[PDB]
Write a protein that binds this ligand. Sequence first.
Ligand SMILES: [Mg+2]
Ligand SMILES: [Mg+2]
Ligand SMILES: [Mg+2]
Length: 180
Amino acid sequence: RLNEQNNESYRYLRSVGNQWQFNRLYKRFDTFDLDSDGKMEMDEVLYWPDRMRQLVNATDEQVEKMRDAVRVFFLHKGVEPVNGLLREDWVEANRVFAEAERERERRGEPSLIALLSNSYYDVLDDDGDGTVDVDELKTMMKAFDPQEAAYTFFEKADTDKSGKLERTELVHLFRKFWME
Ligand SMILES: [Mg+2]
Ligand SMILES: [Mg+2]
Ligand SMILES: [Mg+2]
């Protein structure tokens, strides 16, 4: 069972008075239980920024900003600080987070997906031109475990055909991906 006591998204919804109730997906979980112990843990998810950090390019501040966004993001996705997130609570945790994000949009509050995206944006672009290119996106894939395949994400996200992903466009990429 998931509720305001063991899940941050229910904590968020009830803090603002939203009474929402929960009544492929698992493959994503299995990609994220690195040790396959069927629990996702904060040390485990915090591995992903550690990999990204080794592949670039980036300042301590930029890396820490990303580390923090990843931590906030997975916490709200249900990964509790010490207790983690069991495979059996994964599906719910996902849907409650989707509601929390819709509620944040309704209240004009910052998307946690957007926070995560913007944090990665500053780490993915570190020739410091100030935009992300398709080679830079390749690095993102390799960090989240396949480089060619970023050509697919990329074409979908550069709706101006500029040849570079700009902040807005990356937010759209991450955003669409969790929900569709
Ligand atoms: Mg695990
Ligand atoms: Mg760049
Ligand atoms: Mg563009």
